[PDB]
Design a protein around this nucleic acid. Structure first.
Ligand SMILES: [Mg+2]
Ligand SMILES: [Mg+2]
Ligand SMILES: [Mg+2]
Ligand SMILES: [Mg+2]
Ligand SMILES: [Mg+2]
Ligand SMILES: [Mg+2]
Ligand SMILES: [Mg+2]
Ligand SMILES: [Mg+2]
Ligand SMILES: [Mg+2]
Ligand SMILES: [Mg+2]
Lengths: 234, 67, 101, 121
RNA sequence: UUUUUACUUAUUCAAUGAAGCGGGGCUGGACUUGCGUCCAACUUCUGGAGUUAAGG
RNA sequence: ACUCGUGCCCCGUGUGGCGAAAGGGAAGCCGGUUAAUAUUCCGGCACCUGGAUGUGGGUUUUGCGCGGCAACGCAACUGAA
């Protein structure tokens, strides 16, 4: 059906001083609450300041593919749950009620190692075969020495993304560090492949970038100003 | 344990890493309220040494005072 | 000796400025996008006497660029300004008496 | 990735609020209704001027509790003597007690009410 | 080593309802010849009105 | 918006209290009456505020009155943000 003659256009000229401005997105300049403001300014300040290498080495994290491979291996060795422990204890109870000694019904467990002090002791005694350190430990101090400790003890390490990721791997909220020491023979080859891949695809690339200071990157407007200055000079 | 390493690192208050962390945390605490609840101790080794435990009933409060 | 009168004046109390008959401070519009980039038009509604001030003040009404309301400002009246006069405030405002540039 | 904000001001989002569901009452026995009719109405006034208006105006004068209001006095009179009033005036005497002039309805005789229920003659 | 002037994130000041800041690119132009650059974004006759969008 | 409180949808720049018996402010007059109160009681005659729903009247049925040149009038004679 053709449009009736009495429908027409009323375009609005939003120029200065001749129409009320439309309701546009003003999300770039909202007065955010103080906690949000501090949260963003904290990251801005860490980017602005020169970061010493010991802290700056933590922005180079494991790639997505390597992290996926590592978690594919680790999900076979995540620790036992409460129900699994209860069932194991129940069957051990039936065993020693029958008179058969404990650790006869159950076998030696292979599980991923977590807990900061436990992991540190493991790599100090060289029992740890691979170490994965969370990249976002609130007090980096707790883990700032871990790459140096692993290098000193000659143990492959990788700074991996996700403290919460390690936590859900290990049935906690956060873990902040994870170590694998021994695996079963059916995936010792998988462990060797993961160790070699982690080595040659993270450590060799970060061998040099881990030694330099964290960038004193300026803001967007400052970067544009410097670009304009250089272009005008040249 | 990592707390021995933390104790040794906390002595090096003039080092670059500790100086950077102190400067940034000082800015953050200055932006925060004069007295405010802290979710966790920013010095876990020092807190545990002074008697802090990670269980319900233990609280950390951060306070700044005029100098 | 005593605290002298000049010292006492800074305490406030009986030496505070009188403010009941003063209706609003004489200030320009807040510097906004319209005043920065083009101009905005306002209408002079009245020329009022402000007690304690030798100069008269001008009440000028503007439209809000972002809302349907209208905003009344209180300027220091420049001599020659009159009720019902259009004044213009902005970068591109004409160079006439009463315009804010 | 971020929501559109048409206003440059941030408001605290509205969150769910729950009414109190205590697992123990703070007090076990709710108090009985204080200031019942027996406390509201104390005794009739039998002075000269109090008895004069019983005949001249069909009103009864009572001494009532100081914290009782006109509605409470009316309800107490209705419950205690089956008395219906058209209006009640109140004052607080210099001795601290409240005096109430309750005018009865025209169909009921204050003299008979006083004689039969109030013991006044 | 001493002085000078550069950076912005410490720190300090000011404004606002924290609305249009900084880069561009679409158009409009005006200035120039190895077709190349600069500017701008639509309100000034009138003591009216302008909001809860028309349209594609 | 549901049988049922709890499901949503819009607006937002603000977001306390006390402080006047002479400032601001809803509405009561006359006559009579007591030993002592009265613009408070009694009689007559009124007014204001708030809440409810009626009778009549008015207006309309694709709609929300009519008149006067006009100043305006008439008993009403829809009206969110
Ligand atoms: Mg806790
Ligand atoms: Mg002195
Ligand atoms: Mg009274
Ligand atoms: Mg053209
Ligand atoms: Mg008050
Ligand atoms: Mg008064
Ligand atoms: Mg009366
Ligand atoms: Mg009367
Ligand atoms: Mg009424
Ligand atoms: Mg009708």
């Amino acid at each position: 059906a053709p449009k009736n003659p009495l429908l027409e256009k009323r375009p609005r000229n939003f120029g200065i001083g001749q129409d009320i401005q439309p309701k546009r997105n003003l999300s770039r300049m909202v007065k955010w609450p103080e906690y949000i403001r501090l949260q963003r300014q904290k990251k801005i300040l860490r980017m602005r300041l020169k970061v010493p290498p010991a802290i700056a080495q933590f922005q180079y994290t494991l790639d997505k593919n390597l992290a996926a491979q590592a978690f594919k291996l680790l999900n076979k060795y995540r620790p036992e749950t409460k129900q699994e422990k209860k069932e194991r204890l129940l069957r051990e109870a039936t065993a020693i009620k029958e008179g058969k000694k404990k650790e006869d019904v159950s076998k030696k467990p292979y599980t991923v190692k977590y807990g900061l002090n436990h992991v540190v002791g493991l790599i100090e005694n060289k029992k740890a075969s691979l170490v994965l350190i969370a990249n976002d430990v609130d007090p980096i101090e707790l883990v700032v020495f871990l790459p140096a400790l692993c290098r000193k003890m000659g143990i492959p390490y990788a700074i991996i993304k996700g403290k919460a990721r390690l936590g859900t791997l290990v049935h906690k909220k956060t873990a902040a560090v994870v170590a694998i020491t021994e695996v079963r023979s059916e995936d010792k080859n998988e462990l060797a492949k993961l160790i070699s891949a982690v080595k040659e695809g993270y450590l060799e690339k970060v061998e040099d970038t881990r030694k330099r200071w964290g960038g004193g990157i300026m803001g967007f407007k400052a970067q544009k100003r410097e670009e304009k200055r250089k272009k005008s000079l040249e | 344990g990592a707390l021995k390493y933390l104790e040794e690192l906390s002595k090096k208050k003039q080092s670059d890493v500790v100086r950077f962390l102190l400067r940034v945390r000082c800015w953050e605490y200055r932006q925060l309220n004069v007295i405010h609840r802290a979710s966790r101790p920013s010095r876990p080794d020092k807190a545990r040494r002074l008697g802090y435990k990670a269980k319900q009933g233990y609280v950390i409060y951060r306070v700044r005072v005029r100098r | 000796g005593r605290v002298i009168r000049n010292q006492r004046k800074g305490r406030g109390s009986v030496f505070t400025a009188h403010t009941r008959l003063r209706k609003a401070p004489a200030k320009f519009r807040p510097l906004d996008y319209a005043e920065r980039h083009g101009y905005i038009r306002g209408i002079v509604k009245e020329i009022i006497h402000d007690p304690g001030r030798g100069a008269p003040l001008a009440r000028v009404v503007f439209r809000s660029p972002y809302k349907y309301k209208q905003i009344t400002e209180t300027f220091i009246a420049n001599e020659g300004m009159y009720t019902g006069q259009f004044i213009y405030a902005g970068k591109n405002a004409a160079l006439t008496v009463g315009n804010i540039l | 990735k971020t929501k559109v904000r048409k206003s440059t001001t941030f408001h605290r989002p509205k969150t769910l609020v729950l009414s109190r569901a205590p697992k123990y009452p703070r007090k076990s026995i709710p108090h009985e209704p204080r200031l019942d009719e027996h406390k509201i109405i104390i005794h009739p006034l039998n002075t000269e001027g109090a008895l004069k208006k019983i005949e001249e105006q069909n009103t009864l004068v009572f001494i009532v509790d100081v914290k009782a209001n006109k509605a409470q006095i009316k309800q107490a009179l209705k419950k205690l003597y089956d008395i219906d009033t058209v209006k009640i005036n109140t004052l607080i005497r210099p001795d601290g007690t409240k005096k109430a002039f309750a005018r009865l309805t025209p169909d009921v005789d204050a003299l008979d009410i006083a004689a039969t229920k109030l013991g006044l003659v």
